[PDB]
Ligand binder design. Structure first.
Ligand code: GLC
Ligand code: CA
Ligand code: ZN
Ligand code: ZN
Ligand code: ZN
Ligand code: ZN
Ligand code: ZN
Length: 435
């Protein structure tokens, strides 16, 4: 990648959103963006589930039917998936790799959908568990491969009424990751580097752990919950990272309601994954399932200058927000955002913190303002004592430099938070001359 690599905590782009334009144009559409995203500093792209789903052309991939059909067989009323054909996906991955950008596969293995009606001896009724007709002829299945069966009735969880996969069966283990004919093998064979595990609360952490033991690669599990202990327990057991839903909700509490203290408190008392283990936290401002944060500018300013590994939501970058502001924060994240964090000021609508720097990144000062007016504060930042600091976003309307006296005191300023009028509510500072 241009700046930091995925394995180095680089920024990730969720290259989709709920119900992207159909017609099989998504893979090509994303492929055309690779050169721009490379220049923007994106280190990896997370793609939606690539397999043929029950709802065919309308499927978002979360109702997988034939895992081994990436848009190559006429099935469920279509050859290509909603996103495109197999080759288009392969070409996308090849283009990403040509630019050193990694690709993350969205693995949906808790459930399956689109099976034929079949008598189920354990349910005592008919179930849509007959998957013997999948066009790929790979990973066929019947009621024995789902809950309930002769092993047990249920596992950690189900999703709606979709046939719930029993990973304890060797047949299913073989087809999903335990062989060179597995779904993991197939995804890896076409270029996928990492994994994003869907609804991990629906099955055991051991599944992800064994998958990773066999294939390695960067990984994150989607464990939708606010209980940090539960998320970190799953993370340490599975060996994968977890999306920081706890931080997501706390950022919303603070940034969308002039309640910064709510976020400070959460960060101080372990109510976020990132404040407990920044090496396990995958941070985000929004995703395809939930998007409650309205004031996204200070939110992105925060996850891109604070600790953890940030993800940028496709729609914010390509449709709703000022792309240049995001490109700027990615540059800042990879060049300045390093080291431990020290909060130096806060009130209901303002948050100022310092990143103390690491071996490659000098550190920075983030000044978030949720108020509708220009603000300025005298702050004690000994980290930058006796230095020339520069504002790196340009949100002050121009090129601005300041001298932090030998003591550590400096008068910092932040623009109004009125994005509707081009005032984004944040300024970011660091040593002059970095980039
Ligand atoms: O400026 C705008 C956008 O912000 C968010 O991302 C909302 O979810 C979206 O509905 C809105 O259009
Ligand atoms: Ca399950
Ligand atoms: Zn096509
Ligand atoms: Zn089971
Ligand atoms: Zn909100
Ligand atoms: Zn673009
Ligand atoms: Zn204030």
């Amino acid at each position: 990648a241009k700046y930091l690599e995925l394995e180095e905590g680089g920024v990730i782009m969720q290259a989709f959103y709920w119900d992207v334009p159909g017609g099989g144009i998504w893979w090509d559409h994303i492929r055309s963006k690779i050169p721009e995203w490379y220049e923007a500093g994106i280190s990896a792209i997370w793609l939606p589930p690539p397999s043929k789903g029950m709802s065919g052309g309308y499927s978002m991939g979360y109702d997988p039917y034939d895992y081994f059909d990436l848009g190559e067989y006429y099935q469920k009323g279509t050859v290509e998936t909603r996103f495109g054909s197999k080759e288009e996906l392969v070409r996308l991955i090849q283009t990403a790799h040509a630019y050193g950008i990694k690709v993350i596969a969205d693995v949906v293995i808790n459930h399956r959908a689109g099976g034929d009606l079949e008598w189920n001896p354990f349910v005592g009724d008919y179930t849509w568990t007959d998957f013997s007709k999948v066009a790929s002829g790979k990973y066929t299945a019947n009621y024995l491969d789902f809950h309930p069966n002769e092993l047990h009735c249920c596992d950690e969880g189900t999703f709606g009424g979709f046939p719930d996969i029993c990973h304890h069966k060797e047949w299913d283990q073989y087809w999903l990751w335990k062989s060179n004919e597995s779904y993991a093998a197939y995804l890896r064979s076409i270029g996928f580097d990492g994994w994003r595990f869907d609804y991990v609360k629906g099955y055991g952490a051991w599944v992800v752990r064994d998958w990773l033991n066999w294939w390695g690669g960067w990984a994150v599990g989607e464990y939708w919950d606010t209980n940090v202990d539960a998320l970190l327990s799953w993370a340490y057991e599975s060996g994968a990272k977890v999306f920081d839903f706890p931080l997501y909700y706390k950022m919303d509490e603070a940034f969308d309601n002039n309640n910064i203290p709510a976020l400070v408190y959460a960060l101080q008392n372990g109510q976020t994954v990132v404040s407990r283990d920044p090496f396990k936290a995958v941070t985000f401002v929004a995703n395809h399932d939930t998007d409650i944060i309205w004031n996204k500018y200070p939110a992105y300013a925060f996850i891109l200058t604070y600790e953890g590994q940030p993800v940028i939501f496709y729609r914010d970058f390509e449709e709703w927000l000022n792309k240049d502001k995001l490109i700027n924060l990615i540059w800042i994240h990879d060049h300045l955002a390093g080291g431990s964090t020290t909060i130096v000021y806060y009130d209901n609508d303002e948050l100022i913190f310092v990143r103390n720097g690491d071996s490659r990144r000098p550190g920075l000062i983030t000044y978030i303002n949720l108020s509708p007016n220009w603000v300025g504060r005298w702050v004690y930042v000994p980290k930058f004592a006796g230095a020339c600091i520069h504002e790196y976003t340009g949100n002050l309307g121009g090129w601005v430099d300041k001298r932090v006296d030998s003591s550590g005191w400096v008068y910092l300023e932040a623009p109004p938070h009125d994005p509707a009028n081009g005032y984004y509510g944040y300024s970011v500072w660091s040593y002059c001359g970095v980039g």
